[PDB]
């Protein structure tokens, strides 16, 4: 419903959001390793926050189930 994020790295961004609602993340410190996200500050909920977090990345944050997430790798792994 409300989110506060800022420059750091996508990994730490998702990490920070996780602490908010206390859900389970499935992500390895490698796919998110390096890419930066200029942050996010608005009235954002779960799904809508992730979609914006894609700004600056080529990854896809995919809700695992219920309220949890998993990092689905599909940057440019094939234009098929």
Curated annotation (Swiss-Prot):
Subcellular location: Cell outer membrane
Conditions for induction: For induction, the TonB and the ExbB proteins have to be active. Regulation by the iron level mediated by the Fur protein and induction by citrate plus iron suggest that the Fe(3+) dicitrate complex must enter the periplasm where it binds to a transmembrane protein, which regulates transcription of the fec genes directly or via a further inductor. Induced 2-fold by hydroxyurea.
Domain of life: Bacteria
Residue ranges of the motif TonB box: 23-30
Similarity comment text for this entry: Belongs to the TonB-dependent receptor family.
Record function comment: FecA is the outer membrane receptor protein in the Fe(3+) dicitrate transport system.
Oligomeric form and interacting partners: Interacts (via periplasmic N-terminus) with FecR (via periplasmic C-terminus).
Name of the protein this chain belongs to: Fe(3+) dicitrate transport protein FecA
Organism: Escherichia coli (strain K12)
Lineage: Bacteria, Pseudomonadati, Pseudomonadota, Gammaproteobacteria, Enterobacterales
Name of the encoding gene: fecA
Covered range of the whole protein: 34 to 113 of 774
